[PDB]
């Protein structure tokens, strides 16, 4: 409750679920872009659409 003793550790429950879930795959997503930008070779492929 609002004037309790462990109220501060409750108010950091759902932010600690956010900056540890979301910052994990943000950093996995950043590292997987930086593998594509820096190691997978740049290619320019042209495909004739037959539409």
């Amino acid at each position: 409750p609002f004037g309790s003793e462990g109220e501060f550790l409750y108010s950091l429950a759902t932010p600690l679920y956010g900056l540890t879930f979301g910052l994990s795959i943000l950093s996995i997503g950043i590292g997987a872009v930086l593998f594509q930008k820096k190691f997978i070779p740049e290619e320019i492929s042209v495909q004739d659409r037959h539409d």
Binding site: P1, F2, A13, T14, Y17, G18, F21
Partner: protein, 55 residues
């Protein structure tokens, strides 16, 4: 949203709260509102999955 329907009861039948949130104690609420207050409060990390699902 598949997660969030494992805990939600969508009826409108009236029932008093008698749960864990201290201001809303003994308030005539629907069961759709009491289980929406059980996701936020009485499910471990259920407020997170509820807030992700709205954003």
């Amino acid at each position: 949203g598949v997660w969030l329907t494992l805990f939600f009861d969508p009826s409108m039948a009236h029932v008093t709260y008698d749960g864990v949130y201290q201001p809303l104690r003994g308030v005539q609420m629907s069961r759709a509102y009491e289980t929406a207050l059980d996701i936020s409060f009485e499910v471990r990390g259920g407020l997170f999955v509820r807030q992700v699902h709205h954003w």
